[PDB]
Design a protein around this ligand. Structure first.
Ligand SMILES: CC(C)(NC(=O)c1ccc2c(C3CCCCC3)c3n(c2c1)CCOc1ccccc1-3)C(=O)O
Length: 517
């Protein structure tokens, strides 16, 4: 069936940014008839998964638990309250959510409304159209957590095991990839890019996902709500623009429901697993985060692997998940990008090899540049500093430049909102040494001798963007550093740890103590 049907009603508004002006380009991209044919490989895998699901027990969250787990900056309800009101258990929001939950149990058919908007996201320049998000009202969102919050995390882990990527901290991901890679005699890996994965998700895919939830041991009321949410919301429904006008109907995954991530993870794992069997990949290990898929297996030979991947892709396509980028076999782990990252090697103080996650700095640099400029309530630069703390480009460029700006504006102690790892943290910049040491270990203040590919990518990327060479940054760093040290206190600690790389004569970096008093 068609992933979308449109009524012509415009999708109205809520280095460049995406806007509603390109919504037409995306709609054309995401709108197509899906054809899905399933075979015994798919059925065999689904049965194995259901058997694992059958061992999971999961519980209803009360209205209050679900409110407390509601993120602070969610789009407000059209029923007179917003995310802060939910977090604060205001009577207004509490009363409405109870009415919404009751209606979910008593009505299991009436399509639930959703809003569609185009995202505003910053990119560097072939310009990409804005992403479309589809989401139900805040009240419904909280009820989703009541029914399914205890499901959507626990369940995929049990079903998929080490393949479920969301269980891993950043160092655990690296560890899993490197160990998997080193366990093959002749490793071959490839990422698989599904073309607009959300649009490829069929009604059958979504009823399958529901059938897998129900394999869980649930409360009766939870089964009812999960069935209802599926029928009224998940499988499809009407789309409303920001103006209150209907602009079409959906028959695929909505991007902004609680089950988007769990569901894409299960369905991607299910389809890919079966496709591995169809292709006869040997000693397969998969890693899955939602729609993002990477496979590492035992090489059968250069042309064999190429043929294998083409048969892999044919299976995924039959299963309704056709490739955006045709997949490509790699024989070097560094060259495999999954979840916008790749493993790379450097050396620590004693010259030990340290693997860490890095990525092409283009988008992080562009967004940070954008945030310097227009002073946005969004601080993506700080999140990138944390996520990619060990990297060449985060240490020498982003840290240097932003601690530079923090000093000048004397903002060293103003906490910034930071959305990372699926949560919104209130981050004080002086905490960065302690944060980094926990996430990445001390080696992250001491890494040197980065790979030639990594260095080339960074230096080349800077040139493309008109950013000063790394040499400029090392010089600026030494200045920012001395300023931090001179101020002493927590500022000094930042100079000592975050910038010991810019200095000839290294200070000794010892384990930073937890807070006292
Ligand atoms: C001319 C010179 C040498 N420039 C700088 O010092 C300088 C510092 C930081 C940055 C940055 C960012 C680096 C990462 C943190 C956010 C800003 C970017 N650019 C500069 C140029 C060049 C133009 O604007 C950009 C557009 C896209 C990506 C990066 C940038 C001067 O001294 O005036």
């Amino acid at each position: 069936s068609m992933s979308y049907t449109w009524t012509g009603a415009l999708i109205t508004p809520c280095v460049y940014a995406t806007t509603s002006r390109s919504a037409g380009l995306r709609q054309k991209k995401v709108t197509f008839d899906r054809l899905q044919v399933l075979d015994d490989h798919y059925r065999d895998v689904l049965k194995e998964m259901k058997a694992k699901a059958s061992t999971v027990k999961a519980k209803l969250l009360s209205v209050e638990e679900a409110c407390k787990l509601t993120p602070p900056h969610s789009a407000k309800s059209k029923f007179g309250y917003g995310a802060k009101d939910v977090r604060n258990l205001s009577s207004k929001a509490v009363n409405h959510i109870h009415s919404v939950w009751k209606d979910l149990l008593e009505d299991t058919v009436t399509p639930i409304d959703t809003t569609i908007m185009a995202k505003n996201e910053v990119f560097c320049v072939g310009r990409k159209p804005a992403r479309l998000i589809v989401f139900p009202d805040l009240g419904v969102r909280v009820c989703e957590k009541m029914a399914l919050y205890d499901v959507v995390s626990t369940l995929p882990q049990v079903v998929m095991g080490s393949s479920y990527g969301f269980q891993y901290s950043p160092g655990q991901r690296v560890e899993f990839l490197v160990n998997t890679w080193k366990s093959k005699k002749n490793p071959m890996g490839f990422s698989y890019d599904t073309r607009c994965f959300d649009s490829t998700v069929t009604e059958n895919d979504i009823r399958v996902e529901e059938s897998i939830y129900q394999c869980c041991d649930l409360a009766p009321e939870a089964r009812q709500a999960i069935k209802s949410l599926t029928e009224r919301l998940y499988i499809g429904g009407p789309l409303t623009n920001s103006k209150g006008q209907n602009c079409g109907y959906r028959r695929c995954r909505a991007s902004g429901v609680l089950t988007t991530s769990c569901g894409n993870t299960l369905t991607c794992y299910l389809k890919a697993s079966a496709a591995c069997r169809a292709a006869k990949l040997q000693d397969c290990t998969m890693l899955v985060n939602g729609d993002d898929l990477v496979v590492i297996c035992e090489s059968a030979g250069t042309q064999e692997d190429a043929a294998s991947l083409r048969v892999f892709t044919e299976a995924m396509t039959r299963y309704s998940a056709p490739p955006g980028d045709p997949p490509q076999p790699e024989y070097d782990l560094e060259l495999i990008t999954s979840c916008s990252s790749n493993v790379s090697v450097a050396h620590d103080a004693s010259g030990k090899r340290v693997y860490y996650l890095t990525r092409d700095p283009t988008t992080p640099l562009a967004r940070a540049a954008w945030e310097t400029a227009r002073h946005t309530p969004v601080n993506s630069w700080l999140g990138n500093i944390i996520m990619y703390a060990p990297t060449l480009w985060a240490r020498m460029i982003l840290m240097t430049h932003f601690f530079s700006i923090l000093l000048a504006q004397e903002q060293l102690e103003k906490a910034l909102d930071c959305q990372i790892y699926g949560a919104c943290y209130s981050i004080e910049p002086l905490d960065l040494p302690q944060i980094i040491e926990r996430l990445h270990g001390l080696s992250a203040f001491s890494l040197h001798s980065y790979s030639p590919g990594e260095i080339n990518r960074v230096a080349s990327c800077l040139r493309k963007l008109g950013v000063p060479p790394l040499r400029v940054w090392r010089h600026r760093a030494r200045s920012v550093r001395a300023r931090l040290l001179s101020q002493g206190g927590r500022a000094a600690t930042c100079g000592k740890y975050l910038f010991n790389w810019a200095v000839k004569t290294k200070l000794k970096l010892t384990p930073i103590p937890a807070a006292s008093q």
